[PDB]
């Protein structure tokens, strides 16, 4: 719940190792976990808040000019000077024009000339940085098992809104009864700050990395301005017209807000009005789950005469939900839910609600479960067999495995070696795979990066051809490995 | 002398009245009555929908968005024929006359 | 698929793929037919007015 | 019992108000203020002038 229809959702099986399960979760998706007991929790990530930023840089985007002084000395005696070149607030440039007795001076040469202009600034880029503290991730962890009002509605108080910061720890959270859950986040292995720059324009903000933002044109100014207006650039902005021979002149280059946006394509955007409201990015929890009842075992198989009040409602490969309305004298009991096959009973499904439970009286409790890939009879009644429902999950086994392989390829994509940490309880194989892909993606790190969609797929096809040319069985670690990783990376990036 | 205006490009623009709509999961592709004007800019997309959203059937349902398009200062591109144009030539002689 | 009096049962991809202008279900005060290259045709004689 | 309407195709149509416009030989491509509604059907062509 709070997790239905938000597809790309991260099913997690297994709790072994005692209780610890490694989960990598991000703003876009959410994670549903399972175990043989200890009922299914839902991990949705919501807003990140970096509390205390520090302003590192001001770029001017629109500028205007005034007071427009200029001067020229003479043909080759004197190179011109001007007293308002003294301020660096003025922009200045030397050039050479021509001079003669028409101009008045004498000696008929190509004499030097200066021009100067006062530099005033319009609205700016207010680029800031944040340390890897003063930032909190807010995670709503919410349980299944009933409580209508909406298997969606992330707004609402059913799942606790627990904060976490790198100045914090094991993240103890409490729920109704059973839900003492401890979460050990590792936020420093997340976005890897001290390589980030939040970038605020007039209304919006973006998250761009640091070297690019330092390397960008559109005049420099450091964070300690307030008086100064000391812009140590302006060869990238204001341009000086020089016609054929005579007097040169100043030209404001105009607002580069559109060119700025075209520059920061391929970068995630962010609302930043109230301090900060940082979004899309991932983090890595280790999850410990001892401390968990099943919201009572402590009950009976119920009497009977249930009633559906909702449709069949298939979501996203198998997860189907059914909202039943108990009728009778329950004194709240369990719900005898089963997913069976046909006659000569071969009961084969799974229930992801584990131990669903009726509330006090009439209240439309809802149940999600996964049938197999074909025919299925979902049954809920007992003594007069009360209610069966037919259902046909279209599916496949092979198609399900192939789609899971595509999910694993997308995890070998965007989320890095954290996606090797996305499983759990792996011991030897998972850890050695994470270390091997760590050093391997480090060699394919910076290290052949910085390239666009087109050039990546083109360098992929040329390197897969030179692998196809087949010398001495280097063609494998060439051609097939490199062609797979380049193509399945290039067609998936720039999302 | 006499140009004729061929084209206007907008350089800065602003948006207002900001309507948007979504149908349902795979029944209906969404419509909106202010898509009728070409002055509005419009785009279809597909998001997701479920009961949390309220509708039902739990799909990836379509959605539209719309915005009124108002324009700031423009490029006022003009053309000229190979008439209505004059060249001014000063022809001047030598031989004296200071100044 | 309902015409003036009759109806037919046709599968979905064909019915979406068919010409004869599009309009979605939320018309009412719409008449926003996003097609019409398949319907109304424009005569152009040799040189002049179309 | 309960269907849901997904689509309207028009079968017969009629036309009215029939506006047309042409600018000039190669200065100007023609515009018309009733091209603003998508309710109107519009087409560019080239004739002679």
């Amino acid at each position, epitope marked *: 719940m709070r997790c239905i229809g938000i597809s790309n959702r991260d099913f997690v099986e297994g709790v072994s190792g005692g209780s610890w399960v490694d989960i990598v979760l991000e703003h876009g998706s959410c994670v549903t976990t399972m175990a043989k007991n200890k009922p299914t929790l839902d991990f949705e990530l919501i807003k990140t808040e970096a509390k205390h930023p520090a302003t590192l840089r001001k770029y001017c985007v629109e500028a205007k000019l005034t007071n427009t002084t200029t001067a020229s000395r003479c043909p080759t005696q004197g190179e011109p000077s001007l007293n308002e070149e003294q301020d660096k607030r003025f922009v200045c440039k030397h050039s050479m024009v021509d001079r003669g007795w028409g101009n008045g001076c004498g000696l008929f040469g190509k004499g030097g000339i200066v021009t100067c202009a006062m530099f005033t600034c319009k609205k700016n880029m207010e680029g800031k940085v944040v340390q890897p503290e003063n930032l909190e991730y807010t995670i709503v962890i919410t349980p299944h098992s009933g409580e209508e009002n909406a298997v969606g509605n992330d707004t609402g108080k059913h799942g606790k809104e627990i904060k976490v910061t790198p100045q914090s720890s094991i993240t103890e959270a409490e729920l109704t009864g059973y839900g003492t859950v401890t979460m050990e986040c590792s936020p420093r292995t997340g976005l890897d700050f001290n390589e980030m720059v939040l970038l605020q324009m007039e209304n919006k903000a973006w998250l761009v990395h640091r070297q690019w933002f330092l390397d960008l044109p559109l005049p420099w100014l450091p964070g300690a301005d307030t008086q100064g207006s000391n812009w140590i650039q302006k060869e990238t902005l204001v341009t000086f017209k020089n016609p054929h021979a005579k007097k040169q002149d100043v030209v404001v280059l105009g607002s580069q807000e559109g060119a700025m946006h075209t520059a920061l394509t391929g970068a995630t955007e962010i609302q930043m009005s109230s301090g900060n409201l940082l979004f899309t990015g991932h983090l890595k929890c280790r999850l410990r789950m001892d401390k968990l009842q099943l919201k009572g075992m402590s009950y009976s198989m119920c009497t009977g005469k249930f009633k559906v009040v909702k449709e069949i409602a298939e979501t996203q490969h198998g997860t189907i939900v059914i909202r039943v309305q108990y009728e009778g004298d329950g004194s709240p009991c369990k719900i005898p839910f089963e997913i069976m096959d046909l006659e000569k009973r071969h009961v084969l499904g799974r229930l992801i609600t584990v131990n669903p439970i009726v509330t006090e009286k009439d209240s439309p409790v809802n149940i999600e479960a996964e049938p197999p890939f074909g025919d299925s009879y979902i049954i809920i009644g007992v003594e007069p067999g009360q209610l069966k429902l037919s259902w046909f999950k279209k599916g496949s086994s092979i198609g399900q495995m192939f789609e899971t392989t595509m999910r694993g390829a997308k995890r070998m994509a965007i989320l890095g070696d954290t996606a090797w940490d996305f499983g759990s309880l792996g011991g030897v194989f998972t850890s050695i795979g994470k270390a091997l892909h760590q050093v391997f993606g480090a060699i394919y790190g910076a290290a052949f990066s910085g390239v666009s969609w087109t050039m990546k797929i083109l360098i992929g096809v040329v390197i897969t051809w030179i692998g196809m040319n087949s010398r001495s069985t280097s063609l494998s670690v060439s051609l097939v490995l490199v062609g797979v990783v380049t193509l399945y990376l290039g067609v998936m990036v720039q999302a | 002398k006499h140009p004729a205006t061929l084209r206007k490009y907008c350089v800065e623009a602003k948006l207002t009245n900001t309507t948007t*709509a979504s149908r349902c999961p795979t029944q209906g592709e*969404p419509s909106l009555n202010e898509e009728q004007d070409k002055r509005f800019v419009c785009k279809h997309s597909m998001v997701d*929908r479920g009961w949390g*959203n*309220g*509708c039902g059937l739990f799909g990836k349902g379509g959605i539209v968005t719309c915005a009124m398009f108002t324009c700031k200062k423009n490029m006022e591109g003009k053309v000229v024929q190979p008439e209505n144009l004059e060249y001014t030539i000063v022809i001047t002689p030598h031989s004296g006359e200071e100044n | 698929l309902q015409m003036e009096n009759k109806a037919w049962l046709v599968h979905r991809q064909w019915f979406l793929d068919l010409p004869l202008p599009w309009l979605p279900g939320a018309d*009412t*005060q719409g008449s926003n037919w996003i097609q019409k290259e398949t319907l109304v045709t424009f005569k152009n004689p040799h040189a002049k007015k179309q | 019992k*309960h269907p849901a309407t997904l689509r309207k195709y028009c079968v017969e149509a009629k036309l009215t108000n029939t506006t047309t416009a042409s600018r000039c030989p190669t200065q100007g491509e023609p515009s018309l203020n009733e091209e603003q509604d998508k309710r109107f059907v519009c087409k560019h062509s080239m004739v002679d002038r």
Partner: antibody
Amino acid sequence: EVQLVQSGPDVEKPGASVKVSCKASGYTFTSNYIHWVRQAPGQGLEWMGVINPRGGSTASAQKFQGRITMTRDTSTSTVYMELSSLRSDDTAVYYCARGGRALFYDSYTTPRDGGSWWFDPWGQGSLVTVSS
Amino acid sequence: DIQLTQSPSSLSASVGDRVTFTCQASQDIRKYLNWYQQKPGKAPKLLIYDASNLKTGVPSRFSGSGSGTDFTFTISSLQPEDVATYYCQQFDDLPITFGQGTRLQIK
């Protein structure tokens, strides 16, 4: 409190168009749909159509095919109904109730039930007379 | 399209009587029905939602029942402030249709 306020009564010419406002108070304006219902004096009630405040999709009944337009202002929390091609049958009292909201859009029916159609929050009534 | 017949069209009864109304639908509207009062030329009020439930603030003398297509509205004790025009209304399938109406007269 839980309250809606409509505009005053209007008299228009045949073939003209009329605009009726519906201003909200007492709640979060994008937490309910707005629905417009007419009533001729020698008749019972009759549903005109539906607007969503959040976003702004509309629909209407077949008796008002192409004659009705619905807009809003989120800043003033107000809904505007504009009826076009007025004739003498349009002389009626107009009403604007609210609905429980399928969060995103439209006139859904499966989420339980709207819950009124339209007399809990509705307002005070707009009389519209089409005459010469 | 979905029609809704309301019966009877008008009634007269004395103060304290029990009165019942019947609405019939051409389709299955299984629980989607609402009952309203309307004082003439006034601001009217909801009585029953979901054809079985009171609104908070409505006195307990009102009730409603019925499941399939036939629905019964019931005032237990008729009171002199209850002279109104009463409507039943479908919610299903959305060419949303009202009943015709039921006027009351006090004896």
